Each structure stands twice: as C-alpha cells, then as structure tokens.
Amino acid sequence: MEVIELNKCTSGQSFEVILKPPSDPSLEEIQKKLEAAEERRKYQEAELLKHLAE
Amino acid sequence: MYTFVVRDENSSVYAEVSRLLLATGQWKRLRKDNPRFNLMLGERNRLPFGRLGHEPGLVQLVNYYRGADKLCRKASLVKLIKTSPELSESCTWFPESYVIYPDEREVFLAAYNRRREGGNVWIAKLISSEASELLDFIDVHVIQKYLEKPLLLEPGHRKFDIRSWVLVDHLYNIYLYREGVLRTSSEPYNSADKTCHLTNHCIQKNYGRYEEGNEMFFEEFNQYLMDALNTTLENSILLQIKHIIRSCLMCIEPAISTKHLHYQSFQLFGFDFMVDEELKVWLIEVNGAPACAQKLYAELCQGIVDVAISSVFPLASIFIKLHH
Amino acid sequence: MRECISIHVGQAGVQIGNACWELYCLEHGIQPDGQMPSDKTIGGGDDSFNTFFSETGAGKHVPRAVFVDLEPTVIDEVRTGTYRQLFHPEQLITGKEDAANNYARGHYTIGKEIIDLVLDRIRKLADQCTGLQGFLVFHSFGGGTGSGFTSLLMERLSVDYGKKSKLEFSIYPAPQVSTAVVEPYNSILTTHTTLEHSDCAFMVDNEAIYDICRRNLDIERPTYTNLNRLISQIVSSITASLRFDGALNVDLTEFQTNLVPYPRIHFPLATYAPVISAEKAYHEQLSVAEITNACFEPANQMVKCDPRHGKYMACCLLYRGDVVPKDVNAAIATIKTKRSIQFVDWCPTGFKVGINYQPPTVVPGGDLAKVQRAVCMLSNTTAIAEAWARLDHKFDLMYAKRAFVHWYVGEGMEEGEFSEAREDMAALEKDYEEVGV
Amino acid sequence: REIVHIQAGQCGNQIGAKFWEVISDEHGIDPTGSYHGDSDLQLERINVYYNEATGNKYVPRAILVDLEPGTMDSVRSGPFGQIFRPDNFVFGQSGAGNNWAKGHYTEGAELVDSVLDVVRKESESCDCLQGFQLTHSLGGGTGSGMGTLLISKIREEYPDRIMNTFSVMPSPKVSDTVVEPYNATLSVHQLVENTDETYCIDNEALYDICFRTLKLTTPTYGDLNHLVSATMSGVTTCLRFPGQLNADLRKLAVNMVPFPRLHFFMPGFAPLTSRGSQQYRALTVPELTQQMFDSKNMMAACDPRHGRYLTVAAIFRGRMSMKEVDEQMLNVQNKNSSYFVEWIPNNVKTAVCDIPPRGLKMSATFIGNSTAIQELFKRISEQFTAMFRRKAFLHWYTGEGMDEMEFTEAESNMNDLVSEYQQYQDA
Ligand SMILES: Nc1nc2c(ncn2[C@@H]2O[C@H](COP(=O)(O)OP(=O)(O)OP(=O)(O)O)[C@@H](O)[C@H]2O)c(=O)[nH]1
Ligand SMILES: Nc1ncnc2c1ncn2[C@@H]1O[C@H](COP(=O)(O)OP(=O)(O)CP(=O)(O)O)[C@@H](O)[C@H]1O
Ligand SMILES: Nc1nc2c(ncn2[C@@H]2O[C@H](COP(=O)(O)OP(=O)(O)O)[C@@H](O)[C@H]2O)c(=O)[nH]1
Ligand SMILES: COc1ccc2c(c1)NC(=O)CN2c1nc(C)nc2c1CCC2
Ligand SMILES: [Ca+2]
Ligand SMILES: [Mg+2]
Ligand SMILES: [Mg+2]
C-alpha cells in the first residue's frame, strides 16, 4: 500500500493510503417567484371574501 | 399474530408457504404494499431491500438474500469463481467457462486452440464442436466445456442432472434438503439434435418411459448405484455436492450476510449438478428462485416454515446442516 | 486563516447548534462567559480556532454563528441558557408564529417577512471576516422552518456569496421521534430547492442515532438531548480539521474536493465509533483495528444502509486520540481482505486519513464515556440513495391522493412544484444507480 | 399563542362552563381566579386559555353568548361563574325557540355585532392569536344558528386564524324537538366550509355510553356533560401543558386534515367513568390503549371498523412508561393495519403528559379522523329527509324568511360530504 503526503504537526498527523489506482437563479427571479405566490395567496383570499360577501 | 405480504404470485414454492402460514392461525396476510409486515415474500426483480428494516416495532424478514444474484446469473457465477481465491481459477468442480460479449474471447480461443492439438465440445447459454459456429449464434452469453462423457443410467443410456434444494436461514446456516431429484433424459445419449443433450423438463415434451415425469428420486438412484456400480449415493456423489454447496455459499457470505443488518434474509436455492462417468460431480448453475417437485412440495415448504420462518417468529429434521 | 459562519435554522438546527457550540467550547477551553485563558493574543489573532470564534477587546470568544427560528420558544432557551453570555443578542433571530410543519409557509409566507433581516444579521458577521470561506447550515428536513426557510436562505446565500462554499448538516426524518406527518413533503421540496446551492451535505437519519442511543448507550427512550449530544460528537469530528492544526480538510473547499467528485452526489455517509455508555463500569478500550472495523458496520452509520451493495467515490478516516499511521495501515490492510469495499472504476481505491492526538471530548454528566481513541469515517457511497428511495416512496404514497396538498397551495405554492421537486429526486436516484451499478 | 373560547346557547354554555371548571382545577385556579397550586407546569402555558388580571388573577379568555338570559344566569350562579369577565356576557332576551333561522338570520343578527365587539377586544390584547374554539349544539337555535353565523363572521374578520369547534350532535335518544335534524343539517353545511377542526360530540354516543357501559338507567345532561368535560380536557392537554410536544391549533389541523372538508374528528376517552363514582384500580397502559380504540369509548356513535383512519392523535396522562406507550401504540397499528390508510405513512402520533386529570391516576384521550364518521352524517341525513320529503315543520323556518331551496342545498352538501368520506374508504 502506498503511503503519500505524510504531514505531521504537534496536534496529529495527516496522510493518504492508496490500495489500487483507477481503472444559480438571480435575486430578481427569486423575488419574482416569492411575489407570484403572494399574488396567488391574495387572490385566494379575495375569492374567499367575495364568497363571504355573497 | 404475525403478518406477511406476498409480492410474487407466480412462485409455486411460496404459494404453498403462504397457505401453510395462514393455516397456522398465527399468521395473517396483508396487501402487497402494506409496509407493516413481519415477512416479505418479495418479487424477483428489483426487490426493494432499501425499504426493509425501517418500521419501528416490527422485526422484518425477507425470503431473498440481497446480492445473491452474483451466484445465480450465468455470467456472474463464472466471474465469481475465477476472481474469488476461495474458489480460484484452478477450481476442480466447475467446468472451463468464459464470458463472451456479443469479453474473454482471445483468452478463450487460446484454450480452444490448445484443444485442437488433442475433445473440444462446448456449450453456450447451443452445443457445437470447433466453436466458430456458436460465436455467430451468440451475436450476454457464457460458453462452457460440454461434458462429453457423462454418467449414463441403465437401462436407457440416458443423461441426467441432479437438483439439490438448499435453504440458508437468517443465521447463515446452510440446510441441504435430504430429498433431491434427477431430471432424466428419456432419449439415449448420442455423441455424434438437443433433446438427448439437454435435460430440461420443458425440453422433454420418448418422455416418461422409465419413471413418472422423468424424475428419479434419491431412493431408486441410490439402489441403482448399489446394484450397478457397487457404491452409494452418499459416498460417490453427495459428498462432493455438499462440498460445492458449502464452498459456494461460504465465499459470498461476507457480501450477502444479514447478521448485523436492520432486516434479515433467508433464501431457497436450487443447485444443479452433473455427474460424469467417473462419479465426479460438476456444478453447472445455481437458481435463486427454484421450483420444487410435486412429491416434495409439502415436505420442503413445511421445512421452510420450521427452519426459516418460525425460527424468527415462533409459534405458541428434513435438512442436512452443512457445517462451517 | 479563513473564517466559517454557522447558521442554525429551525428547532432541530438550533438545539443541535447548542450541542455543537457547547462541545466546541469544551474542546477549545472556552468558558461559558466567553473567556479563554489558553488564548494569549487578547483581542484577536489568526489561530485555527478563530475560524469559528471571534475575539473582542475584553477577551471574549464569540461564535461566528446565527440562530434563526420563526418561533421564539426554542431560541429563547438559548437566550437564558448556560451559554447566554456567549452569543450577541443580534445573532439570535426569532419570529412570532412558526411554519406549522409546512414547507410553503416557511419558504413563501413567513420566510419572505424575515429573510432580509437574517441576511443583514448574517452580513454583520461576514463583515468581521478577513477571508470568509462559506457557511455550515444546520437544519431538519421535516420541519416547516428547517425545510422551507433554509431553502430560501440557501438561495439567497448563493446570490450574496457566490464564491463561498455551503455545507449542510441535515436531519433526515424518522417517524419514531417526529410529530409531523408531512415530513416527506417538506424533505423532497427542500432537497430539490437546495440541491444546486449545497456543495456538501451530511445527512443524519434520526432513526440511526436513535437506535445507536438505544443499543450502545442503554437508553430506553432517547430524548433530543441524548440524540444531539451524539450528533455534535460526529459534527465536531467533521469540523475538527477546520478548528485545529492539520493538513487534511483545512478549508470548506477541500470537503468537496476530497468527498464530492459529482456535484449532485454530495451526500457523504458518516460512520462513527466507538459509542460507549458512561454508565458501563467495566469497559475494555477498543483498538485502532476494532474501531476502524466498526466504521463498516451499518449499525454505526448516521444512515442505515448497506455499503456492500453500492460503490465508493471517496473515503476519509478522521481519528481522534491515541492513533498512529502504522496501526491505521495495518487495520486497513486486514479490513480490505474481509469486507466488500468496491470503488467506482474512475476513482482510486484508498483512504485519506487525518489524526488529531487530543482524544474526544465529552460533556461532563453526559451519556458518552471517555474513550482513548475514536474515528469518524466519511464515505461517499451510492448506498446512501436507499434513504432517498425510502423518502420518495413515502412521498409517492401521499401525493398520489393529493393528501395535505391543499395546505401548501393555500400558502401560494403551486401543485407543480411538488412534481417538479419529485422529478428532480427521481433524477437523483437514477444518478446514484448509474454510478453504483 | 392565545386561544379565544366562545360558548353559545344552552348546550354550548353548560359544557363550556364545565370545561372551565375542569381545566381551572387542573391548572390550580380557584373560583375567585387566584392560583393555589403546587406545580409550575400548571402555569407555564396558562396564557393559552387565561388572561393574567389585576393582583395576578387569571381570567378565562371566554365569551358567553346566548339569545335568552336563562342558562347564562345559571352559569354566573355556578361554582366557577364569578371567574368569567362580566363584560364577556352577551345575551338577548327573545330566545331562538330551537329555530336555526331565528339564530342565524333574524334574532341572532341583532346580537352578533355586539358579540364580535367582545371578540375583538379579547383578540387585540393577544400577543399572538392562534384562533378560536366554540362550544355549541347543532340541534337548537342559538348555538346552531347563531353559532355558525358567528363562525362565518369571525372568519371574515380573522381569515388567517384557526376555527375549532366542539359541536354536539342531536339524537332522538336525547331529543328536545323534532326539528333537530333540520338545525343539524343546516349547521353541518356551515361547519364544512368555515371550520378547521370540529370535534363531533354525538349525544347518541354519550347516551349509549351512559346506558350500556356506565349502567346509568336514566342519564341526565349532567351525566352526558361529565363525558364531554373529560374529553374536552384530554383533547386540549397538549395545548395547555408543556411536554415534548407543545402543540397548537394550526399544527393540529395541518397534521390531522388531509383534505379541507374532512375535518370532523371522532373523540374517544378511557377509562369511562360515571360521576360521583370512585374506582380505585388504575388501568395498565395496554388497557388504556385497547379501550381508547374501542368503539364503546367513541364520543361519536360510529363503528370505526366500518371505515379507515386517515389520521390519529392520542394523549396519555399520568405517570407511566413512555416506552410501554410506544410499544402498545405500535402494537395497535401493527395488529390492525387494515384500518389505517396506507397512503398516509405513520399517521398515528402520541404524546404523554405527566399531570393526570382529577380523579384518575392514568387516562387516555383519542382523537380520530375516521371515514366512519359518515355514519353520523348519514343518520342525520336520514332523519332530515324523512321530514323534508313531506316539507314537514318547514313553516317554522319559512316564517323567518327562509326558502325551501336552502334546505335542498344543505341536504345536498351533507350528502356530498358523505360521498367524499366514502371516496377514501375504498382508496
Ligand atoms: N436530532 C434532532 N432532531 C430534531 C430535533 N428537533 C426536531 N427534530 C426533528 O425535526 C423534525 C421536525 O422539524 P423541526 O426542526 O422540529 O421543525 P422546525 O424546523 O422548527 O419548523 P416548524 O416548527 O414547522 O416551524 C422531526 O423529524 C424531528 O424528529 C432535535 O433537537 N434533534
Ligand atoms: N457443461 C455441460 N456439460 C454437459 N451438459 C450441460 C452442460 N451445461 C449444460 N448442460 C445441460 O444443459 C441443461 C440446461 O442447462 P442450464 O441448466 O444451464 O439451463 P437453465 O438455467 O435454463 C435450466 P435451470 O435453471 O433449471 O438450471 C442441463 O440440464 C444440462 O443437462
Ligand atoms: N350533551 C349535552 N347536550 C345538550 C345540552 N343541552 C342541550 N343539548 C342538546 O342540544 C340540543 C338543544 O339545543 P340547545 O343548546 O338547548 O338550543 P339553544 O339554546 O338555542 O342553542 C338538543 O339536541 C339537546 O340534546 C347539554 O347540557 N349537554
Ligand atoms: C396524525 O399526526 C399528528 C396528529 C396530531 C398532531 C400532530 C401529528 N403533530 C402536532 O404538532 C399536533 N398534533 C397534536 N395536537 C394536539 C393539540 N394534541 C395532540 C397532538 C398529537 C398527540 C396529541
Ligand atoms: Ca487570540
Ligand atoms: Mg419549530
Ligand atoms: Mg334548550
């Protein structure tokens, strides 16, 4: 087994052992979808208050 | 009560296991996709092992070993025997085999050319000499040495294969069913047409001449070996079979064992063997979803409940344990 | 030195953050009032622990942390707890009403009201950083705040800090300890929205740590305090390299380099050993070989799965205690001959090992006993996809009947986001199987 | 997270008064509003149902509504009557005469605005209002007719708050008038639209329990209300006391209601106890679990084996092994998995409170959203149709301005509710 890149310090040791070798959306778009859902909420509430007005 | 589900209705074996479980009065069956089961008699393809063992308050058991397909596929078995040092390339009970992709072609051709200096009959899975024919027939298959000198029963000069049923429980105990069957060829064996060369039940449909259903069981075959060859089934054949079953399952135990798993597995295996004219046993294939013989369905399936199911879910020997 | 900011969202994120920061102070020798007599550079410095702590003129060591919850009763216990002096009031943010186990209520309705405040408080910590690497985000999959608001936060952190890494410590839902029936919905929704914004996510199935507490700690009914003290031990093992001198996993980018070759497959499996009960009078201390062998038992993993029926892409061994490289290599040699450890053909078969000589630190009066050596294994195995199969199947059962969907649509969410999130999960499952078969 | 309690009509105020009697004793508050308890678990979440008053008295956040002064004067004379804020008494003089139309359209319209003024003053003082809980019957006129008019108007002013009700269903076994199926069918139509959670307290189920199980030959309303007050205490345990689950009304609705219209819960209680009767053997955890699921313990006269549980909630109260509670609850689900829908995984959630109710060392309260509740609505739909096919007694309602068309609409909607509960009984 190969043991490579052994680094030692006073806190401990680091190394690597090898056995076998190989064989975003914009802020503009985020706010737009946050307000498209708020629009849908206010619509659904408006339909409720319209129904209660009847 | 215990609860179980059935996800393979085409399973002749576990159809009988379901009836026996229900008749106990301590097992009730749920719907296919009800998660609150104790036992799963699952499907054969893409069984969801990743969903087992996550129901609180339920000990879950399944009738299949995840990863056992590497022993029950013709291509997987050959790769396993060659690459596993427990079995090795020098394995004395497996015929020479090579995996061909329509590969090992160049390495295979070297053996077939070394077979030209001398018999060179092979089978692909069909049967042919020389071997150039079968390659164009293949165009995944596996080519294997055809056993040209098999043991032939008399009267009839017949070919046969030996099927042994093996159950491995949640503890990885290996249970060999004391009852096996010889699937006979009711056609005389011709060394120079595949009805005599292939011993499959469906291929035989001279059928039924010497015994009912072309199925000779162990009692008659033992008496034949005594009268004809002055030996017994135990000494001449069954010792090698138990060695091959033991060796094959001990090899893959680290890969399939459910000893410390959140769910448990058992599985019924069907081992098929070939016997040559010198009473040497050869393993040909392993089946992960085998069907039993009608004469033995009642006894074997009852032994599955006793040994594999009731051992985990107890209520209010027909096997030979292979020791390791 | 480069700083890391921790963000704790929802109940699970806050209480686990409590456990971690309690453990950090004990390891680094920081007192509940923020004082650290070990520190000789008063008022600042670029030591390794300053990655997680800032320093004031009075000598206080302040966590680079922000706690967010849409409902105040959980963070209020932090405001009056043992470490109340540790945190500044501005880095503890609470709302009035929570998300009610509703992803859409935490992401859209209530999340919009508080997101700009949190990012401002987050910006106040980043302005005290000379070289910010990124963020560690602690949250739950099932919570309405842990799922809904975190995904909204992860979206905005990618916008405001594009060149920074973002790691997750996510609590996978387990019905044994959860009180919400719609956690598969919240989990799939938040995994879909966060996937492209998270560079590395360490999942912790509550079922796994629950049974570990039952089996190995002799605790009949483990509480969140039992669970979180064990979780923080694993988290500390993972973050020890960022807080201590060493050469392995020194920055957040090295986590993705060493563990995540495929961006979408960024869910390493964590296995930890030994977990020993403090009430066990007689205990035989386990060797390097025994604890390294335990890293391959599913009973010790943070997610119950079978790594034998998958393939590895990377594997780190993080040792704490009396461990030397000679014994690690001997243990690895014997383990390879006896276990099914299959790497993908485009990866080298090997382990990156990090050893910290200081043994694991335990909370006084806790359930964990002091061990002479422990190890946490980080292994990116395709076997962890079993948890996605479990989660997606439960999602499929409920969504086929549109059960509870009206709660999410009633918060402005469209029914299309469900199937959009589920198709992404379907793509993730096939990516795993393509690599692992 | 404060809750505004409202009680309307004769039945609503009598079970409402007994509710405040029971939970004031649990929280250690005397009739004078002073606290004289031992544990501080009694005061941690006391803000949910009580306002802290002068001298640190505790005044219930309760609003008492009726169209006649009779029953409400009985409340003020009752054992805890002086604990209620006197300004929250709102009453007319005409009464409603068991007439849904009088309560909902004529007599109750005169009084509803003054009720909303008291509701508004209680809500503006709330730090974070959860919603409302209403106690009322559906067979009378005030609690049924005016109660639903209040619910409709409360939803208009507070559209983002939870509406919870304790609704007593009529039964010919405990019948005041023949027109009770009319008032119930008219009220259920309103409850389907304008409430988030309704506890179906069936007077038929309360009668059979008092008769068949408790061996009371002639049950009074006091015997029926003893069962109501025990259930109301249990179902509100996780709202009033701290535990591993500090529940609220919204989380309760989100987790119990998979489809908005199917929000009618079968309550259940164990052990069943008769008044003034002391039994000295505490029940084991297996016994509480088996009984609380028994049909004989359901407060709605429905056979749960005729349907399937969509969601289940359970409260165990007392000193007991929570592990044994886990084992026994998991046992019921794994032993009767047929009666829980498989398309809502892990649809049973349980909580444990250390403080038991008065008189019992161990108790269990059952909250079930079962599709078998359609039997209750079927029963009332049959009694409704028997009279309505002859338009019998309709003149009492048309004389207050109602049209036959409104009865047909209410009949249709309840039959639709029955069909919708039948939709998921087979899926
Ligand atoms: N390990 C652990 N899991 C927790 C803890 N608290 C909650 N959970 C899990 O988190 C899930 C519920 O999410 P929560 O974090 O409680 O909810 P939230 O993030 O506050 O969101 P909302 O309450 O809905 O507004 C459940 O599956 C719990 O099991 C904790 O302290 N430790
Ligand atoms: N190397 C070989 N030498 C001689 N005969 C062989 C042979 N390989 C196969 N056979 C014959 O071929 C028959 C069928 O082969 P095989 O068992 O692989 O197919 P199969 O898998 O479809 C039947 P099963 O699944 O029940 O075992 C065997 O019964 C045997 O008689
Ligand atoms: N359980 C119970 N039911 C009651 C009580 N009082 C009345 N009822 C029922 O409620 C219906 C009568 O409604 P009621 O409240 O008296 O009319 P209201 O005053 O106009 O609201 C009948 O079906 C009664 O059986 C009570 O104290 N307890
Ligand atoms: C079906 O799954 C459920 C069912 C109910 C709830 C929850 C999940 N979860 C909650 O937070 C609220 N809740 C509850 N509410 C209230 C007020 N009393 C109780 C519970 C559960 C136990 C008693
Ligand atoms: Ca310093
Ligand atoms: Mg919360
Ligand atoms: Mg009356």
JSON list of N, CA and C in Angstrom, two decimals, chain C residues 92-128:
[
{"chain": "C", "resi": 92, "resn": "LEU", "atom": "N", "xyz": [-29.23, 36.08, 17.38]},
{"chain": "C", "resi": 92, "resn": "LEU", "atom": "CA", "xyz": [-30.32, 35.19, 17.73]},
{"chain": "C", "resi": 92, "resn": "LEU", "atom": "C", "xyz": [-31.61, 35.83, 17.23]},
{"chain": "C", "resi": 93, "resn": "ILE", "atom": "N", "xyz": [-32.18, 35.27, 16.16]},
{"chain": "C", "resi": 93, "resn": "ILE", "atom": "CA", "xyz": [-33.29, 35.87, 15.44]},
{"chain": "C", "resi": 93, "resn": "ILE", "atom": "C", "xyz": [-34.51, 34.97, 15.57]},
{"chain": "C", "resi": 94, "resn": "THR", "atom": "N", "xyz": [-35.64, 35.55, 15.99]},
{"chain": "C", "resi": 94, "resn": "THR", "atom": "CA", "xyz": [-36.88, 34.80, 16.14]},
{"chain": "C", "resi": 94, "resn": "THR", "atom": "C", "xyz": [-38.06, 35.60, 15.60]},
{"chain": "C", "resi": 95, "resn": "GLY", "atom": "N", "xyz": [-39.05, 34.88, 15.09]},
{"chain": "C", "resi": 95, "resn": "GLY", "atom": "CA", "xyz": [-40.32, 35.45, 14.71]},
{"chain": "C", "resi": 95, "resn": "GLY", "atom": "C", "xyz": [-41.38, 35.21, 15.76]},
{"chain": "C", "resi": 96, "resn": "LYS", "atom": "N", "xyz": [-42.64, 35.33, 15.35]},
{"chain": "C", "resi": 96, "resn": "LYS", "atom": "CA", "xyz": [-43.77, 35.17, 16.26]},
{"chain": "C", "resi": 96, "resn": "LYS", "atom": "C", "xyz": [-44.51, 33.86, 16.07]},
{"chain": "C", "resi": 97, "resn": "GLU", "atom": "N", "xyz": [-44.91, 33.53, 14.84]},
{"chain": "C", "resi": 97, "resn": "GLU", "atom": "CA", "xyz": [-45.58, 32.27, 14.54]},
{"chain": "C", "resi": 97, "resn": "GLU", "atom": "C", "xyz": [-44.73, 31.46, 13.57]},
{"chain": "C", "resi": 98, "resn": "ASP", "atom": "N", "xyz": [-44.69, 30.14, 13.77]},
{"chain": "C", "resi": 98, "resn": "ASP", "atom": "CA", "xyz": [-43.81, 29.28, 13.01]},
{"chain": "C", "resi": 98, "resn": "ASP", "atom": "C", "xyz": [-44.48, 28.84, 11.70]},
{"chain": "C", "resi": 99, "resn": "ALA", "atom": "N", "xyz": [-43.86, 27.89, 11.01]},
{"chain": "C", "resi": 99, "resn": "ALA", "atom": "CA", "xyz": [-44.32, 27.42, 9.72]},
{"chain": "C", "resi": 99, "resn": "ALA", "atom": "C", "xyz": [-45.33, 26.28, 9.82]},
{"chain": "C", "resi": 100, "resn": "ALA", "atom": "N", "xyz": [-45.64, 25.81, 11.03]},
{"chain": "C", "resi": 100, "resn": "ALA", "atom": "CA", "xyz": [-46.67, 24.79, 11.24]},
{"chain": "C", "resi": 100, "resn": "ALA", "atom": "C", "xyz": [-46.40, 23.53, 10.40]},
{"chain": "C", "resi": 101, "resn": "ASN", "atom": "N", "xyz": [-45.15, 23.09, 10.39]},
{"chain": "C", "resi": 101, "resn": "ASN", "atom": "CA", "xyz": [-44.73, 21.89, 9.66]},
{"chain": "C", "resi": 101, "resn": "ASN", "atom": "C", "xyz": [-45.04, 21.99, 8.17]},
{"chain": "C", "resi": 102, "resn": "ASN", "atom": "N", "xyz": [-45.10, 23.21, 7.64]},
{"chain": "C", "resi": 102, "resn": "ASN", "atom": "CA", "xyz": [-45.50, 23.46, 6.25]},
{"chain": "C", "resi": 102, "resn": "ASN", "atom": "C", "xyz": [-44.32, 24.11, 5.53]},
{"chain": "C", "resi": 103, "resn": "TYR", "atom": "N", "xyz": [-43.77, 23.40, 4.54]},
{"chain": "C", "resi": 103, "resn": "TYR", "atom": "CA", "xyz": [-42.67, 23.95, 3.75]},
{"chain": "C", "resi": 103, "resn": "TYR", "atom": "C", "xyz": [-43.07, 25.27, 3.10]},
{"chain": "C", "resi": 104, "resn": "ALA", "atom": "N", "xyz": [-44.26, 25.32, 2.50]},
{"chain": "C", "resi": 104, "resn": "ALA", "atom": "CA", "xyz": [-44.68, 26.51, 1.78]},
{"chain": "C", "resi": 104, "resn": "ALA", "atom": "C", "xyz": [-44.90, 27.69, 2.72]},
{"chain": "C", "resi": 105, "resn": "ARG", "atom": "N", "xyz": [-45.31, 27.42, 3.96]},
{"chain": "C", "resi": 105, "resn": "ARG", "atom": "CA", "xyz": [-45.49, 28.51, 4.92]},
{"chain": "C", "resi": 105, "resn": "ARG", "atom": "C", "xyz": [-44.16, 29.05, 5.41]},
{"chain": "C", "resi": 106, "resn": "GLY", "atom": "N", "xyz": [-43.13, 28.20, 5.45]},
{"chain": "C", "resi": 106, "resn": "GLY", "atom": "CA", "xyz": [-41.82, 28.63, 5.89]},
{"chain": "C", "resi": 106, "resn": "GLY", "atom": "C", "xyz": [-40.99, 29.25, 4.79]},
{"chain": "C", "resi": 107, "resn": "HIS", "atom": "N", "xyz": [-41.22, 28.82, 3.54]},
{"chain": "C", "resi": 107, "resn": "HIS", "atom": "CA", "xyz": [-40.46, 29.34, 2.41]},
{"chain": "C", "resi": 107, "resn": "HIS", "atom": "C", "xyz": [-41.09, 30.61, 1.83]},
{"chain": "C", "resi": 108, "resn": "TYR", "atom": "N", "xyz": [-42.41, 30.61, 1.64]},
{"chain": "C", "resi": 108, "resn": "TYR", "atom": "CA", "xyz": [-43.10, 31.69, 0.94]},
{"chain": "C", "resi": 108, "resn": "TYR", "atom": "C", "xyz": [-43.71, 32.71, 1.88]},
{"chain": "C", "resi": 109, "resn": "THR", "atom": "N", "xyz": [-44.67, 32.29, 2.71]},
{"chain": "C", "resi": 109, "resn": "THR", "atom": "CA", "xyz": [-45.45, 33.22, 3.52]},
{"chain": "C", "resi": 109, "resn": "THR", "atom": "C", "xyz": [-44.60, 33.89, 4.59]},
{"chain": "C", "resi": 110, "resn": "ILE", "atom": "N", "xyz": [-44.15, 33.12, 5.59]},
{"chain": "C", "resi": 110, "resn": "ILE", "atom": "CA", "xyz": [-43.41, 33.72, 6.70]},
{"chain": "C", "resi": 110, "resn": "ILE", "atom": "C", "xyz": [-41.95, 33.94, 6.34]},
{"chain": "C", "resi": 111, "resn": "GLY", "atom": "N", "xyz": [-41.39, 33.12, 5.45]},
{"chain": "C", "resi": 111, "resn": "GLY", "atom": "CA", "xyz": [-39.99, 33.29, 5.07]},
{"chain": "C", "resi": 111, "resn": "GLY", "atom": "C", "xyz": [-39.71, 34.64, 4.44]},
{"chain": "C", "resi": 112, "resn": "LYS", "atom": "N", "xyz": [-40.65, 35.13, 3.62]},
{"chain": "C", "resi": 112, "resn": "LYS", "atom": "CA", "xyz": [-40.45, 36.42, 2.97]},
{"chain": "C", "resi": 112, "resn": "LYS", "atom": "C", "xyz": [-40.40, 37.57, 3.97]},
{"chain": "C", "resi": 113, "resn": "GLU", "atom": "N", "xyz": [-41.06, 37.42, 5.12]},
{"chain": "C", "resi": 113, "resn": "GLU", "atom": "CA", "xyz": [-41.12, 38.50, 6.09]},
{"chain": "C", "resi": 113, "resn": "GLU", "atom": "C", "xyz": [-39.82, 38.70, 6.85]},
{"chain": "C", "resi": 114, "resn": "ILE", "atom": "N", "xyz": [-38.94, 37.70, 6.87]},
{"chain": "C", "resi": 114, "resn": "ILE", "atom": "CA", "xyz": [-37.81, 37.73, 7.79]},
{"chain": "C", "resi": 114, "resn": "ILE", "atom": "C", "xyz": [-36.49, 37.47, 7.08]},
{"chain": "C", "resi": 115, "resn": "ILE", "atom": "N", "xyz": [-36.55, 37.15, 5.79]},
{"chain": "C", "resi": 115, "resn": "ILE", "atom": "CA", "xyz": [-35.34, 36.74, 5.07]},
{"chain": "C", "resi": 115, "resn": "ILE", "atom": "C", "xyz": [-34.33, 37.89, 4.99]},
{"chain": "C", "resi": 116, "resn": "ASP", "atom": "N", "xyz": [-34.81, 39.11, 4.74]},
{"chain": "C", "resi": 116, "resn": "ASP", "atom": "CA", "xyz": [-33.90, 40.24, 4.61]},
{"chain": "C", "resi": 116, "resn": "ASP", "atom": "C", "xyz": [-33.27, 40.62, 5.94]},
{"chain": "C", "resi": 117, "resn": "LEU", "atom": "N", "xyz": [-33.99, 40.40, 7.05]},
{"chain": "C", "resi": 117, "resn": "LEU", "atom": "CA", "xyz": [-33.40, 40.66, 8.36]},
{"chain": "C", "resi": 117, "resn": "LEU", "atom": "C", "xyz": [-32.28, 39.67, 8.66]},
{"chain": "C", "resi": 118, "resn": "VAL", "atom": "N", "xyz": [-32.50, 38.39, 8.37]},
{"chain": "C", "resi": 118, "resn": "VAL", "atom": "CA", "xyz": [-31.50, 37.37, 8.65]},
{"chain": "C", "resi": 118, "resn": "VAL", "atom": "C", "xyz": [-30.24, 37.62, 7.83]},
{"chain": "C", "resi": 119, "resn": "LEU", "atom": "N", "xyz": [-30.41, 37.91, 6.54]},
{"chain": "C", "resi": 119, "resn": "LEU", "atom": "CA", "xyz": [-29.26, 38.18, 5.68]},
{"chain": "C", "resi": 119, "resn": "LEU", "atom": "C", "xyz": [-28.48, 39.41, 6.15]},
{"chain": "C", "resi": 120, "resn": "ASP", "atom": "N", "xyz": [-29.17, 40.38, 6.75]},
{"chain": "C", "resi": 120, "resn": "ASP", "atom": "CA", "xyz": [-28.47, 41.53, 7.31]},
{"chain": "C", "resi": 120, "resn": "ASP", "atom": "C", "xyz": [-27.65, 41.14, 8.53]},
{"chain": "C", "resi": 121, "resn": "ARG", "atom": "N", "xyz": [-28.25, 40.35, 9.43]},
{"chain": "C", "resi": 121, "resn": "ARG", "atom": "CA", "xyz": [-27.50, 39.85, 10.58]},
{"chain": "C", "resi": 121, "resn": "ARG", "atom": "C", "xyz": [-26.38, 38.91, 10.15]},
{"chain": "C", "resi": 122, "resn": "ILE", "atom": "N", "xyz": [-26.60, 38.15, 9.07]},
{"chain": "C", "resi": 122, "resn": "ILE", "atom": "CA", "xyz": [-25.53, 37.32, 8.51]},
{"chain": "C", "resi": 122, "resn": "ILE", "atom": "C", "xyz": [-24.43, 38.21, 7.93]},
{"chain": "C", "resi": 123, "resn": "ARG", "atom": "N", "xyz": [-24.81, 39.31, 7.28]},
{"chain": "C", "resi": 123, "resn": "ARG", "atom": "CA", "xyz": [-23.82, 40.23, 6.72]},
{"chain": "C", "resi": 123, "resn": "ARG", "atom": "C", "xyz": [-22.98, 40.88, 7.81]},
{"chain": "C", "resi": 124, "resn": "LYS", "atom": "N", "xyz": [-23.56, 41.08, 9.01]},
{"chain": "C", "resi": 124, "resn": "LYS", "atom": "CA", "xyz": [-22.80, 41.68, 10.09]},
{"chain": "C", "resi": 124, "resn": "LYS", "atom": "C", "xyz": [-21.66, 40.78, 10.57]},
{"chain": "C", "resi": 125, "resn": "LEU", "atom": "N", "xyz": [-21.85, 39.46, 10.51]},
{"chain": "C", "resi": 125, "resn": "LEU", "atom": "CA", "xyz": [-20.77, 38.55, 10.87]},
{"chain": "C", "resi": 125, "resn": "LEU", "atom": "C", "xyz": [-19.73, 38.46, 9.76]},
{"chain": "C", "resi": 126, "resn": "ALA", "atom": "N", "xyz": [-20.17, 38.49, 8.50]},
{"chain": "C", "resi": 126, "resn": "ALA", "atom": "CA", "xyz": [-19.23, 38.39, 7.39]},
{"chain": "C", "resi": 126, "resn": "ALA", "atom": "C", "xyz": [-18.34, 39.62, 7.29]},
{"chain": "C", "resi": 127, "resn": "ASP", "atom": "N", "xyz": [-18.84, 40.78, 7.72]},
{"chain": "C", "resi": 127, "resn": "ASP", "atom": "CA", "xyz": [-18.03, 42.00, 7.67]},
{"chain": "C", "resi": 127, "resn": "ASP", "atom": "C", "xyz": [-16.87, 41.97, 8.65]},
{"chain": "C", "resi": 128, "resn": "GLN", "atom": "N", "xyz": [-16.91, 41.09, 9.65]},
{"chain": "C", "resi": 128, "resn": "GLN", "atom": "CA", "xyz": [-15.80, 40.89, 10.56]},
{"chain": "C", "resi": 128, "resn": "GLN", "atom": "C", "xyz": [-14.87, 39.76, 10.13]}
]
